[PDB]
Amino acid sequence: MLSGLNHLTLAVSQLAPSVAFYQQLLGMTLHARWDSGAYLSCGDLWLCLSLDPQRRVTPPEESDYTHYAFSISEADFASFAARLEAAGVAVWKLNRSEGASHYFLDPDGHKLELHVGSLAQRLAACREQPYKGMVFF
Amino acid sequence: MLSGLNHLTLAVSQLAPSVAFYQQLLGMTLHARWDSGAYLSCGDLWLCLSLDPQRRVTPPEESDYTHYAFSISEADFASFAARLEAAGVAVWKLNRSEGASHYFLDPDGHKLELHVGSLAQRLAACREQPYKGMVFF
Ligand SMILES: CCOC(=O)/C=C/c1ccc(N)cc1
Ligand SMILES: CCOC(=O)/C=C\c1ccc(N)cc1
Ligand SMILES: [Mn+2]
Ligand SMILES: [Mn+2]
């Protein structure tokens, strides 16, 4: 069967600024780069940045809610979010509708998130404060 | 410090066909559903389906290369691909890289992939046959 996410590939319009964002600003590990892409890791996540002439820099009001959340500890969350804010990283959402999260944009407008907590923790929180119509299996 | 992918959220135009696709066709575990979304798991992956009226059913020629690859074993790959083909799931690309890959579309045109092989395997192949301009770190 399927066993998890093998990799996340993000199309990017400008390779070097995207590599810098994920490696320098977000702290991910850069393993290789080439004329048309890069490979990074974030823990066990394999991230591929793929140079794509079709990628547009997309304002958050023009894209749907598809987004990518990265795990961070409770101890590190607030100072990492504040650093992104002080660095001028654009945002796309303010209301914490799914727990402790910080919503921010990459250089092309990919919707990213810092989140504290697992799926099990989110299910437990939702039992007390469920989303409208929620059922648990 | 970021420690991995926390969750992947896909915006969906119609919740019931997307739940059918990810749970029934792709075999993911459904943990909860509410009036505007669902939570599933696939191994370590926490997947959220978020009902979003801004999601367009998007032809693959009209989206960029951003895509989401799921892990499967080599032994299971061909029968899972045949299952998707029997269900009429569209393919958006042929495989031309190392490691088996099947490139298929979700009901809203999200670009998905089945892939066999790790980042380490890809890096080993690249060190033997580097892409144009490739540098390692
Ligand atoms: C199309 C370019 O392809 C490459 O692999 C370039 C890599 C690179 C890495 C670090 C630099 N300071 C400059 C260039
Ligand atoms: C596109 C990459 O931009 C940056 O890296 C900019 C600033 C920065 C400053 C302090 C940090 N701890 C990390 C990053
Ligand atoms: Mn999220
Ligand atoms: Mn891929």
Side-chain angles (χ1 to χ4, degrees):
Chain A
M1 86 279 210
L2 304 185
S3 59
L5 195 76
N6 185 273
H7 60 269
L8 174 58
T9 295
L10 304 179
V12 303
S13 65
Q14 306 196 107
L15 185 56
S18 297
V19 171
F21 185 88
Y22 289 94
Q23 188 270 111
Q24 300 172 11
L25 186 69
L26 296 189
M28 299 191 182
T29 300
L30 179 62
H31 295 274
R33 69 183 181 67
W34 65 102
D35 287 351
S36 293
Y39 295 140
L40 302 95
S41 63
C42 181
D44 63 294
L45 175 66
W46 176 7
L47 176 64
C48 172
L49 303 181
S50 182
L51 181 58
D52 186 353
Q54 298 197 327
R55 179 65 203 190
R56 307 303 172 216
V57 178
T58 303
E61 308 87 354
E62 284 291 324
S63 61
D64 61 48
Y65 198 62
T66 300
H67 70 266
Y68 319 114
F70 304 111
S71 293
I72 191 164
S73 71
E74 173 149 349
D76 293 343
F77 171 76
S79 65
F80 199 117
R83 184 174 57 79
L84 298 178
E85 286 283 294
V89 176
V91 302
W92 61 278
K93 174 184 165 65
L94 282 171
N95 166 248
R96 300 209 179 161
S97 47
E98 54 176 359
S101 294
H102 179 73
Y103 298 96
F104 64 105
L105 298 168
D106 99 338
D108 285 304
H110 290 287
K111 281 172 173 165
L112 308 182
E113 174 188 346
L114 308 177
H115 181 75
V116 181
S118 66
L119 171 58
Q121 294 171 311
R122 186 92 298 257
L123 289 167
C126 285
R127 284 189 188 270
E128 303 318 298
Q129 306 201 348
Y131 318 138
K132 185 76 195 266
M134 190 159 194
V135 168
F136 298 84
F137 302 99
Chain B
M1 174 191 291
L2 305 181
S3 61
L5 189 74
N6 189 265
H7 58 268
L8 169 63
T9 296
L10 301 180
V12 302
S13 65
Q14 300 186 231
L15 189 56
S18 297
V19 172
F21 185 87
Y22 289 98
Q23 181 196 27
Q24 298 293 330
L25 190 62
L26 274 56
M28 299 184 187
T29 301
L30 179 66
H31 294 280
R33 177 191 180 147
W34 59 101
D35 289 352
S36 66
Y39 289 150
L40 304 93
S41 64
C42 179
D44 285 317
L45 178 65
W46 171 7
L47 176 64
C48 173
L49 305 180
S50 185
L51 180 61
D52 187 355
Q54 190 168 5
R55 178 65 200 184
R56 192 163 72 93
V57 177
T58 301
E61 305 89 343
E62 295 175 31
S63 63
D64 63 49
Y65 191 59
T66 301
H67 70 268
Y68 321 115
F70 306 109
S71 294
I72 190 164
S73 72
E74 184 176 19
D76 293 343
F77 177 89
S79 58
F80 206 107
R83 177 184 182 80
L84 296 174
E85 287 295 333
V89 176
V91 166
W92 61 276
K93 187 183 166 66
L94 300 185
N95 186 28
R96 297 184 178 79
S97 50
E98 73 81 34
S101 286
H102 183 80
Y103 294 101
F104 63 107
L105 296 170
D106 103 335
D108 284 304
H110 290 288
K111 283 172 172 163
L112 307 178
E113 176 185 352
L114 308 178
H115 183 61
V116 184
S118 66
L119 172 57
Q121 177 180 118
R122 177 60 56 94
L123 291 169
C126 290
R127 280 175 191 281
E128 292 298 356
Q129 183 174 125
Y131 303 156
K132 176 190 154 263
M134 188 155 206
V135 180
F136 298 88
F137 305 91

